[PDB]
DNA sequence: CGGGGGACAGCGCGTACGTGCGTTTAAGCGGTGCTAGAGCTGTCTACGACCAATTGAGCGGCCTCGGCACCGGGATTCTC
DNA sequence: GAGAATCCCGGTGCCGAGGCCGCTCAATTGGTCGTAGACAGCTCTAGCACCGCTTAAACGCACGTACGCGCTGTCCCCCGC
């Protein structure tokens, strides 16, 4: 089975494994690294999306929108302080 | 038609709205000219680098991607 | 189903 | 083109399938994904160079993420990475 | 006699601006960092030069905060420095 | 909040100073609006903090100068 | 006791620093406040330095690790 | 003869080139890049060293010392802007007073 | 390894009377490495954006204009041009 | 520990800011119409990478001399 | 006016800086091979300028009050020894 499905991961391990070469980050890359990277990428996006889903749901909207993302991002201090210099286009204060 | 927009385009009511969004209660009538200056400086800083990005592409047109590059690094520092 | 590991403050966004 | 929106849709359906997403929000997610990726990768590279290493491994990224990431998110993510690579390698 | 309050302050300010030494006591700092590091690992056999670098970094960072908060206090038009001026300074610096 | 036509005319004026001949994607103008609004609002929140620290309801230009120095410089 | 050493960075030492800061007059509160700020700052930087140290899997912390820790904090120090 | 002297520069062009390849900043490097870099480096170093020399002479030292360097950078607005996030061991602070504090 | 030899060369060229503290020279040694990294980073970014395989004089020339303030930049860039042209002819 | 100065609070006064109202003005949207450059594709040649040999410079260690710092004394300058 | 603090001058010590020498490694030189970049051409589209029309927003003025500023008096604390 594919490397992602072997890991159970929902991201293109092959792309990122390629990208690790394509970005010159190192002339060698070890097989777990793109897998480990994909795992944390999935985890990170899940955490934000969960909060943003609550934000849309709380606003009675099915559509997740920048407002709902921004509201989520600023409500978690960790995400907010992690993302303190990220600016959300059409994300209101 | 004598006035020039670059200063005037940013105007008392819009500044008032920005301040209200910024939670300001009341403002001195002097403030607007400071902010226009600051805005010019801020704008001036970013667009110069966008120009140089556009130069390195040798293109006449400036894209949002060039803006994103200039705005990315400059915004994080500022 | 993509369960979240962190235990975090509950928020109302409405 | 080289974009994650399909993977965003996967995890979106996996996390809140009752929610749609604006293309704007989807693009923001793509920008977000790229930002965090280049942040962790650029760090791990410079750490590897500091360690005089021509290769990047799980340890480098596992260290880099613990450097970048807030303390809870770090150990949670670290555990997720170690679990995932354990499943991958045990397979 | 007693010199009037502030003239001593001004002349010592001038002295400490013109001088260049480390102002924090050496061993107190060495110990302090030794302890707070130990929360993260059982034992670190620190390079002393690393401690020196930390001393310089901390001195610089503090003096920068001090001049900023003094600017806040003078904007208040007090001259007494108050913790609220520190909190404000860190807030505006985005450090809070 | 801020008005695209005046804003973009200002933008083109400043660009005209550096290059003297430009073209712009409308997405670039949008991005500049978003950036400028966010930056200004943040600076307003700072200067308000300054004004209330000085126990004024009105913000003053001194508060702008101070905030810009402390955060920006 | 080294906790007390955070108090053991003495009032007059702080005063000396404040004079290098050029400040004229200071309330009695400032010492504990600055002790807290310093503690937080230093704890962060050493956390990063130790993260490097353990990644190199050696008991010795080096000044180079401190330099990297500051650099990733976003501030640079020369001479090392 | 050495590439540096073929350019007429003091900084080690060969060193710069090696360091560029070691840093793998791209897959390839054009031969003009390392010389252009060495040039700009030499210029910057001379420029700052003028100001440090001036400071040392005002302190009537012949030996330049870190204090002189700090006083130089904090005198030049351009270097200070270049170095706003940079700190110097034993550099101290540039002596200055807010006039409102004066009696 | 160090730049100290070249630091001394430039120093004696600009102020042949002066000497330097090895502490200060160490400061310069760190500084030159810092600026070298920063410029190389921008060169990498530019090359990557333009999908280039290579770094050239054109990349560093433009990047310097991004690092330096404009008057210092103008001097640096014109000096670099003169240097590279002299290398090209010699 | 003592003394003095700054901080704080309260009161009065005037001006500036806010609000309302009416009229003017330009933005916002749509359509007109075209050209430039944007992007893509194909081809060819130059440039760098790689390998090998040779030579000179740089690095490391050692030695000698001079510069800087510290200490003591006297005169000048500031402060009460 | 007087006393305390600051500066200048001179001597001595101590070490660091500067220079010299020899060796090793890097830099230079030359040749080969290929691919990346540059150059040219073609086609598409998005960007630019202006008009038409509506309507909302912005501007200007007047009226009112509230807030800011300054003054005064008391009390505590911090500074200095």
Curated annotation (Swiss-Prot), chain B:
Main location (coarse class): nucleus
Location of N6-succinyllysine modifications: 12, 58, 72
Entry-annotated residues carrying N6,N6-dimethyllysine: 1
Modified residue annotations for N6-acetyllysine: 12, 40, 60, 72
Sites bearing N6,N6,N6-trimethyllysine, chain numbering: 1
Name of the protein: Histone H4
Higher taxonomy: Eukaryota, Metazoa, Chordata, Craniata, Vertebrata
Recorded GO MF terms: DNA binding; protein heterodimerization activity; structural constituent of chromatin
Subcellular location: Nucleus; Chromosome
Record-listed cross-link Glycyl lysine isopeptide (Lys-Gly) (interchain with G-Cter in ubiquitin), residues: 72
GO biological process, one term: nucleosome assembly
Modified residues (N6-lactoyllysine): 12, 58, 72
Coiled-coil intervals, chain numbering: none
Residues joined by cross-link Glycyl lysine isopeptide (Lys-Gly) (interchain with G-Cter in UFM1): 12
Signal sequence residues: none
Keyword Nucleotide-binding in annotation: no
Modified residues (N6-methylated lysine): 1
Positions carrying N6-butyryllysine: 12, 25, 58, 60, 72
PTM remark: Demethylation is performed by JMJD6. Monomethylated, dimethylated or trimethylated at Lys-1 (H4K20me1, H4K20me2, H4K20me3). Monomethylation is performed by KMT5A/SET8. Trimethylation is performed by KMT5B and KMT5C and induces gene silencing.
Function in brief: Core component of nucleosome. Nucleosomes wrap and compact DNA into chromatin, limiting DNA accessibility to the cellular machineries which require DNA as a template. Histones thereby play a central role in transcription regulation, DNA repair, DNA replication and chromosomal stability. DNA accessibility is regulated via a complex set of post-translational modifications of histones, also called histone code, and nucleosome remodeling.
Swiss-Prot record, chain C:
Null mutant phenotype: Decreased sensitivity to the cytotoxic effects of 6-azauracil.
Biased composition (Polar residues): 2-14
Localisation per UniProt entry: Nucleus
Oligomer and partners: Component of the 1.8 MDa SAGA complex, which consists of at least of TRA1, CHD1, SPT7, TAF5, ADA3, SGF73, SPT20/ADA5, SPT8, TAF12, TAF6, HFI1/ADA1, UBP8, GCN5, ADA2, SPT3, SGF29, TAF10, TAF9, SGF11 and SUS1. TAF5, TAF6, TAF9, TAF19, TAF12 and ADA1 seem to be present in 2 copies. SAGA is built of 5 distinct domains with specialized functions. Domain I (containing TRA1) probably represents the activator interaction surface.
Family note: Belongs to the SNF2/RAD54 helicase family.
Protein function: ATP-dependent chromatin-remodeling factor which functions as substrate recognition component of the transcription regulatory histone acetylation (HAT) complexes SAGA and SLIK. It recognizes H3K4me. SAGA is involved in RNA polymerase II-dependent transcriptional regulation of approximately 10% of yeast genes. At the promoters, SAGA is required for recruitment of the basal transcription machinery.
Additional remark text: Present with 1620 molecules/cell in log phase SD medium.
Domain notes for this protein: The 2 chromodomains are involved in the binding to the histone H3 methyllysine at position 4 (H3K4me3).
Protein name per Swiss-Prot or TrEMBL: Chromo domain-containing protein 1
Curated annotation (Swiss-Prot), chain D:
Gene Ontology MF term list: DNA binding; protein heterodimerization activity; structural constituent of chromatin
Compartment(s): Nucleus; Chromosome
Glycan attachment residues as annotated in the record: 79
Superkingdom of the source species: Eukaryota
PTM per Swiss-Prot/TrEMBL: Monoubiquitination of Lys-87 by BRE1 gives a specific tag for epigenetic transcriptional activation and is also prerequisite for histone H3 'Lys-4' and 'Lys-79' methylation.
GO cellular component: nucleosome; nucleus
Keyword Magnesium: no
Crosslink (Glycyl lysine isopeptide (Lys-Gly) (interchain with G-Cter in ubiquitin)) position: 87
Keyword field: Acetylation, Chromosome, DNA-binding, Glycoprotein, Isopeptide bond, Nucleosome core, Nucleus, Phosphoprotein, Ubl conjugation
Role according to the record: Core component of nucleosome. Nucleosomes wrap and compact DNA into chromatin, limiting DNA accessibility to the cellular machineries which require DNA as a template. Histones thereby play a central role in transcription regulation, DNA repair, DNA replication and chromosomal stability. DNA accessibility is regulated via a complex set of post-translational modifications of histones, also called histone code, and nucleosome remodeling.
Subunit record text: The nucleosome is a histone octamer containing two molecules each of H2A, H2B, H3 and H4 assembled in one H3-H4 heterotetramer and two H2A-H2B heterodimers. The octamer wraps approximately 147 bp of DNA.
The name this protein goes by in its record: Histone H2B 1.1
Curated annotation (Swiss-Prot), chain E:
Modified residues (N6,N6-dimethyllysine): 41
Residue positions, PTM N6-(2-hydroxyisobutyryl)lysine: 18, 26, 41, 84
Modified sites of kind N6-crotonyllysine: 18
Single GO MF annotation: protein heterodimerization activity
Record PTM N6-methyllysine, positions in chain: 18, 26, 41, 84
Keyword list, A-Z: Acetylation, ADP-ribosylation, Chromosome, Citrullination, DNA-binding, Hydroxylation, Lipoprotein, Methylation, Nucleosome core, Nucleus, Palmitate, Phosphoprotein, Ubl conjugation
Subunit structure: The nucleosome is a histone octamer containing two molecules each of H2A, H2B, H3 and H4 assembled in one H3-H4 heterotetramer and two H2A-H2B heterodimers. The octamer wraps approximately 147 bp of DNA.
Known role: Core component of nucleosome. Nucleosomes wrap and compact DNA into chromatin, limiting DNA accessibility to the cellular machineries which require DNA as a template. Histones thereby play a central role in transcription regulation, DNA repair, DNA replication and chromosomal stability. DNA accessibility is regulated via a complex set of post-translational modifications of histones, also called histone code, and nucleosome remodeling.
Name the UniProt record assigns to this protein: Histone H3.2
Organism: Xenopus laevis (African clawed frog)
Lineage, highest ranks first: Eukaryota, Metazoa, Chordata, Craniata, Vertebrata
Full protein segment contained here: 40 to 135 of 136
């Amino acid at each position: 089975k594919t490397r992602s499905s072997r890991a159970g991961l929902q991201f293109p391990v092959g792309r990122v494994h390629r990208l690790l070469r394509k970005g010159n980050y190192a002339e060698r890359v070890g097989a777990g690294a793109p897998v480990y990277l994909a795992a944390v990428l999935e985890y990170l996006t899940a955490e934000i999306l969960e909060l943003a889903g609550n934000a849309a749901r709380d606003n009675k909207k099915t559509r997740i929108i920048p407002r709902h993302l921004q509201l989520a991002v600023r409500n978690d201090e960790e995400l907010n302080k992690l993302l303190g210099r990220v600016t959300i286009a059409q994300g209101g204060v | 038609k004598v006035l020039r927009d670059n200063i005037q385009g940013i105007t008392k009511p819009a500044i008032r709205r920005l301040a209200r969004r910024g939670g300001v209660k009341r403002i001195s009538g002097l403030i607007y000219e400071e902010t226009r200056g600051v805005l010019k400086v801020f704008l001036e800083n970013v667009i110069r680098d966008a120009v140089t990005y556009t130069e390195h592409a040798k293109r006449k047109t400036v894209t949002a991607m060039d803006v994103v590059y200039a705005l990315k690094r400059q915004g994080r520092t500022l | 189903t993509r369960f979240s590991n962190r235990q975090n403050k509950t928020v109302n966004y409405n | 083109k080289e974009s994650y929106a399909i993977y965003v849709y996967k995890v979106l359906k996996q996390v809140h399938p009752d929610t749609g997403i604006s293309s704007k929000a989807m693009s923001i997610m793509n920008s977000f994904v790229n930002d965090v990726f280049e942040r962790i990768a650029g760090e791990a590279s410079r750490l590897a160079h500091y360690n005089k290493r021509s290769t990047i491994t799980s340890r480098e990224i596992q260290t880099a993420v613990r450097l970048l990431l807030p303390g809870e998110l770090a150990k949670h993510a670290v555990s997720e990475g170690t679990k995932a690579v354990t499943k991958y390698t045990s397979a | 006699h007693r010199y009037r309050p502030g003239t001593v302050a001004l002349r010592e300010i001038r002295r400490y601006q013109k001088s260049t030494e480390l102002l924090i006591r050496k061993l107190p700092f060495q110990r302090l960092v030794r302890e707070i590091a130990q929360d993260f690992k059982t034992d670190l056999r620190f390079q002393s030069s690393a401690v020196m670098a930390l001393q310089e970094a901390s001195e610089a960072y503090l003096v920068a905060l001090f001049e900023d908060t003094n600017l806040c206090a003078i904007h208040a038009k007090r001259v007494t420095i108050m913790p609220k001026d520190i909190q404000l300074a860190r807030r505006i610096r985005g450090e809070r």
